[PDB]
Design a protein around this ligand. Structure first.
Ligand SMILES: CCCCCCCCCCCCCCCC(=O)O
Ligand SMILES: N[C@@H]1[C@@H](O)[C@H](O)[C@@H](COP(=O)(O)O)O[C@@H]1O
Length: 133
């Protein structure tokens, strides 16, 4: 039920990503480079396994998961977390837990653009991705 999310997407706007990274304890030099990086996110499915690739000139990640089933993840900033991804209100909600902390990565389609909202602590970052053909 994840189908409109599938494809290759390019970052076209970012708000408050420095605040989100700083909340997670990312150091200033990594924040600096990240603030100038425009990732490509690729979301594919094979049966009920999703694979989400994030590619850039700086960091690169890949995760595979089944919705609703917890998985181990090592994030771009090297946090080792317990993760689960579900559909909720038509949004793809990715929850990461580690050391009693949590962060959510929520993706929603609005007017054909994929809006990624990242929340940790009080920090709320909104990143807009546009689909590639
Ligand atoms: C894979 C590219 C990551 C770029 C930024 C690296 C340092 C901060 C990492 C924070 C967690 C992951 C944020 C993902 C943001 C996104 O997908 O647009
Ligand atoms: N096992 C890991 C990942 O879990 C971690 O995310 C990543 C850091 O980002 P990058 O690969 O870009 O250094 O290193 C590996 O490839």
């Amino acid at each position: 039920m994840v189908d409109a999310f599938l494809g290759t997407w390019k970052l076209v706007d970012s708000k408050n990503f420095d605040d989100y990274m700083k909340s997670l304890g990312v150091g200033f030099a990594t924040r600096q480079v990240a603030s100038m990086t425009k990732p490509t996110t690729i979301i594919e499915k094979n049966g009920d396994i999703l694979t989400l690739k994030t590619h850039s000139t700086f960091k690169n990640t890949e995760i595979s998961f089944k919705l609703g089933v917890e998985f181990d993840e090592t994030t771009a900033d090297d946090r080792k977390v317990k993760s689960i991804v579900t559909l909720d209100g038509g949004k793809l909600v990715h929850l990461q837990k580690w050391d009693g902390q949590e962060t959510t990565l929520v993706r929603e389609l609005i007017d054909g653009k994929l809006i990624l909202t990242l929340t940790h602590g009080t920090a709320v970052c909104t990143r807009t991705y546009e689909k590639e053909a």
